[PDB]
């Protein structure tokens, strides 16, 4: 009777049929694999909206400790969850040829290696009964062990500016959350795939909502357009300074100088910097002049980079806790653990301790 997804054959149409049937009451879906059966209570994520170039994208949550979640666009679907400590993504595109493109893309780093356990890290999933690829499974923890690439990091990934003077606006919980747009611009000459950008956006918004019950204060609305801007060199600081300047000469962006902006690319910057941000540059009461802007990679192997940079924009410092999203080297963790950072972030979104969690 209960709906299920067979991970040995999961396709775009499987994911779309199951997730489109999720009502406001939620729905139990069993994830099945060889000797694996996880019952997941799936709900629509109504906190976040996403428009990419070509599609509206909807998000879905489980309520489990292994944070099962889904992404559903018109063109693609993602299932992500943790299993035995490691994050696993199932990525399924609707058009067979773009699925073929995506599979080739993700298979390419493993071409050199002939690892005996390759399928643990990367596997093409074939249509149920030459078969076609209908999804790919990626375990980035096992992939990192196999590929053994040099680590990218965040050292010196922000620009700090003289601290704002204090100037009595604080209020209780608003009757509705404030809508904050996160306007993402695909860097000129960059190829971004929708599963990769959407995952970063989901992780970014969710890193904020997990703090001080902030969905009462903010609902993020992501929008992705193309920009003619590209960073003039590999310098990240220079790149951001030029990006912020490019927002001021975009006649389309007039009227939205009080929103949050990211320049996104697939790759990284010089010294293997993953992103860049203006530090403590967004406050709900004062946001202006495109100051809440930053840059972020979108590659699947670096989850949470845009969350990390959004943390900086909202005032979060690096921490010494290697389990924190805000650690200065890349950890793959996705949650704020610093109480000081949590208080700073929430205060910039209008929360005060009197309001509770």
């Amino acid at each position, epitope marked *: 009777v209960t709906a299920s997804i067979d991970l040995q054959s999961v396709s775009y149409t499987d994911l779309a049929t199951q997730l489109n049937d999720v009502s406001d009451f939620g729905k139990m879906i069993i994830l099945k694999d060889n000797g694996f059966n996880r019952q997941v209570h799936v709900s629509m994520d109504k906190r976040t909206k996403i428009q990419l170039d070509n599609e509206n994208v909807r998000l879905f949550n489980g309520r489990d400790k292994d944070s099962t979640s889904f992404i559903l666009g*018109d063109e693609f679907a993602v299932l992500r969850f943790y299993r035995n400590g490691e994050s696993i993504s199932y990525i399924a595109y*609707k*058009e*067979a*040829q*773009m699925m073929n*493109e995506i599979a080739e893309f993700y298979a390419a780093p493993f071409k050199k290696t002939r690892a005996i356990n390759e399928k643990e890290a990367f596997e093409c999933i074939y*249509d149920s009964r030459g078969k*076609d690829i209908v999804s790919v499974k990626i375990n980035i923890d096992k992939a990192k062990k196999i590929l053994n690439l040099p680590e990218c990091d965040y050292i010196n990934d922000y620009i700090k500016t003289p601290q704002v003077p204090h100037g009595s606006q604080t209020r209780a919980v608003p009757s509705e959350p404030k809508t904050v747009y996160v306007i993402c611009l695909r860097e000129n000459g960059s190829t971004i795939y929708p599963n990769e950008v959407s995952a970063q956006m989901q992780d970014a918004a969710n890193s904020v909502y997990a703090v001080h019950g902030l969905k009462r204060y903010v609902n993020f609305h992501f929008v992705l357009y193309t920009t003619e801007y590209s960073c003039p060199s590999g310098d990240a600081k220079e790149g951001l300074e030029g990006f912020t300047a490019s927002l001021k000469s975009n006649p389309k962006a007039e009227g939205y100088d009080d929103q949050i902006y990211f320049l996104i690319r697939w790759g990284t910057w010089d010294n293997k910097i993953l992103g860049m941000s203006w530090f403590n540059s967004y406050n709900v009461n004062t946001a202006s002049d495109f100051e809440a802007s930053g840059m972020s990679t979108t590659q699947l192997m670096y989850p949470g980079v845009m969350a990390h940079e959004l943390g900086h924009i909202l005032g979060a410092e690096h921490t010494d806790n290697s389990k924190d999203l805000m650690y200065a080297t890349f950890t793959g963790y996705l949650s704020h653990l610093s109480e000081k950072n949590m208080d700073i972030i929430a205060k910039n979104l209008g929360w005060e301790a009197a309001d509770g969690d």
Partner: nanobody
Amino acid sequence: QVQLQESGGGLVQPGGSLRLSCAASGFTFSRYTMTWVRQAPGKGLEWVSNINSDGGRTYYADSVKGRFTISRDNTKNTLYLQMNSLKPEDTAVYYCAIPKRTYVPPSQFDDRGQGTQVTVSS
């Protein structure tokens, strides 16, 4: 193997209409972006139109926009090209094809049908 077979070609006078059909088998048609291309004698292969898996998105060469309509029936595994307001420069062999990628205009294809002849006299 992939099999594609075009039909519906013929000779018309300028201003005429034709409807091309392409019967597909050997692959899961309903999952694939599909393409019409045409080739005039001694000329390069010219992209005509794309349609995505479910028919919700269509794309056209500038020279045929407003005159040609691509469509598909995923239950009958058939691709269509409705050709109105035909002109002499539409004369060519027309092929339905699986493009290697979804980007437009495609120039690289995985398989093609054997073609159907369209002639518009002048």
